[PDB]
Amino acid sequence: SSLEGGSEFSERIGNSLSSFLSESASLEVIGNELADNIANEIVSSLQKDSASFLQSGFDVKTQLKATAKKVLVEALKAALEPTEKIVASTIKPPRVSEDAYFLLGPVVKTLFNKVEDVLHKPIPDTIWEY
Amino acid sequence: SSLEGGSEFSERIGNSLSSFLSESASLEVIGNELADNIANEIVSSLQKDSASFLQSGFDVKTQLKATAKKVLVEALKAALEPTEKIVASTIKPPRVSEDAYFLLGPVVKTLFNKVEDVLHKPIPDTIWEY
Ligand code: NA
Ligand code: NA
């Protein structure tokens, strides 16, 4: 189970991310071409490792790509609320002065509300209610 | 191209993360069951989406999981340095009060160094500079 062009796959990841600084590249564009890299590499490497998969259905291979990419997306969205729960658990009083949370909480709620909108997974603002 | 038990896949993710606070669970453990979640869900969802792949049989499907998991790990390692370079670029003065970076910088270098150690990818702390 070795990857097809693993050394070259690692470079493509760096470039996708490096293009945020080297070019003005939307966070959302990079997310998409990272999933393309990962999904593509999974199909490349499976063709290499399975004679039987190579034998099959270029239809199957485009579907594997589409599925793997969809999974990555849905995985990241699934991680957002538990993450907020973790963050909110760390900054909620007594861990922070409740007067201090009056200021801090809305800052983080706002920060994560940006992520909620970029990832199109809106989450209740009640997590931060206290 | 729908996922197999999408609502239930979202839950396995949360539990993997929620176990960071409860159980005081190892970071290496949580990251691993995350790649197993994703790798497993890719195989599950392709059984659902493609008729022939459901027909392909066990030899191929376990290889897919192995490959998918491997691709995820290598993707993370290739992304860590370019990611640090992005984070550092974003929070380095003037972007932040340089007195504020004095407090903030060492927190995130340590934060990222936790990840460096788990994945056996050390990166110079020089990236956080002045
Ligand atoms: Na929200
Ligand atoms: Na380091």
Numbering used by the authors:
A (entry chain B), B (entry chain A): 46 to 175
Manuscript excerpt for this entry:
The mechanism by which CelTOS enables the traversal of apicomplexan parasites through cells within the mammalian host and arthropod vector has been elusive because CelTOS has no sequence similarity to proteins of known function. Therefore, we determined the crystal structure of CelTOS from the human pathogen P. vivax (PvCelTOS) in order to obtain insight into function. CelTOS forms an alpha helical dimer that resembles a tuning fork. The dimer has a large buried surface area of 3003 Å2. Consistent with the structure and large buried surface area, we established that CelTOS is an obligate dimer in solution by sedimentation equilibrium analytical ultracentrifugation. Two N-terminal helices (α-helices 1 and 2) of one monomer pack against the C-terminal helices (α-helices 3 and 4) of a second monomer to form the dimer. The outer surface of the CelTOS dimer is mildly hydrophilic and masks inner hydrophobic surfaces created between the two tines of the CelTOS dimer and the dimer interface. Strikingly, CelTOS resembles class I viral membrane fusion glycoproteins and a bacterial pore-forming toxin with roles in membrane binding and disruption. The C-terminal helices of CelTOS show structural similarity to HIV-1 gp41 and Mycobacterium bovis ESAT-6, and the N-terminal helices show similarity to Hendravirus fusion core; Nipahvirus fusion subunit core. The dimeric nature of CelTOS may serve as a chaperone-like function to retain CelTOS in an inactive state prior to membrane binding as the dimer masks the inner hydrophobic faces of CelTOS.
